[PDB]
Amino acid sequence: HHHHHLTISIDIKAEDRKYQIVENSVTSILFKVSDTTTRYVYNIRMGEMRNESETTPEGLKNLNLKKECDLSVKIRTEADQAFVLSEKHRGNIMLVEFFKYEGIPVLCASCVLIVKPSDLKITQVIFKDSTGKEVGCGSVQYEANLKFALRVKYNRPLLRGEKAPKLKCKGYCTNAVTGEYEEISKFRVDENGAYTDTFYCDDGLQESHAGADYVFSFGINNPYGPPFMIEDTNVPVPSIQKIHLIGRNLKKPQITSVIWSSKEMIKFGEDSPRRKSINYNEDGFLHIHARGMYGQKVRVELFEKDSTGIKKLLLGLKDDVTILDNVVCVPVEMSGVYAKAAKGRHAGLSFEILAKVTPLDTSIAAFEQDDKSLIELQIY
């Protein structure tokens, strides 16, 4: 849709310099000199744009271009040859001067090319901590409930008076069950209703998701999705920020409580009333609370405690249990528990059942219920 090539007519008989805006999609310019009776050549010199008003001809009204356009671009080029434009030319005011031969070169005409700057492209994302200090040069591990900001850096500086581009972001978090990245947000990088280059996370990320992995993917066009890798390439795109979330003030992830609940429903940061007794035909609702263990898998074992203090393994659950948002409810059938406990009793009035939760991450400590947390599986 955008023109990639320009044909500029130059009237030698005219005395007013032509001004031509050259958008960043144009890669070649052809000059058509009005005088077909003799041969002309052209040279091109350029000077850098400094403010956005120079992207228009009237912004060049009170400017001595022969004094500013000083860097050379092309020299003694026949006027029938096209002028090819590339990235090194964008953002420049060019004076093109045309000469004919009459004993010596003779300046006959000129025109100004307003070579607009290139389209902005994301080159890097910088993590800044709660005080604005830049943290590293890539992925980070960061605490929940702690503000931060991500500064997007472009391929070129903005011109004075140039508005920030439309910067968008797609937020991703790992699914607690599958461990795959899932999109949880899509927003424009804004402050006070205007586009900006810095996404400020004023509240931080959720403590319930401590242990998850986040990705914020930015773009002036559609941001990259998973796997966030350059096309035909196994190298990450420079337009993402990876964050491994940990608990705030938490020195290490751990299981915090293991409770037999009177309600199946569990929620992070909330406590339910405990169930104290249960029968063989019923399910116990084992509630596991943790911190920093989003998506972590654990094994559950059922022990029986006797009056002498001996504790014996009754059984372990067949399948492993996946902690979600640092909470998980596991329904435990008391029928097999009763069968194993009664098999090894040849007489009390109930079995004292205690749960043990062992995380598959061996660097995380196991959790055992105590006398205040057990459940009484009743007999007869």
Between the alpha carbon of residue 73 and those of residues 25, 116, 117, 150, 248, the distances in Å are 19, 16, 16, 38, 57
Write down the experimental method used for this entry. X-ray
The answer to whether 32 touches 11, Cβ cutoff 8 Å, is no
Name all domains of the chain by residue range, CATH numbers in brackets: 5-115 (no CATH), 122-246 (2.60.40), 254-378 (2.60.40.1940)
Query: Token pair 């050259």 is at which residue?
Result: 22
- Residue 35 region by backbone torsions, left for phi larger than 0, else alpha for psi between -120 and 50, else beta: beta
- Residue 91 region by backbone torsions, left for phi larger than 0, else alpha for psi between -120 and 50, else beta: left
User: What are the φ and ψ backbone dihedral angles of 260, each rounded to 5 degrees?
Assistant: -85, 110
Q: How many other CB atoms sit within 10 Å of the CB of residue 191?
A: 12
β-bridge pairing 104-115 and 18-22:
parallel
Resolution (Å) of this entry? 2.2
β-partners of residue 284 are 332
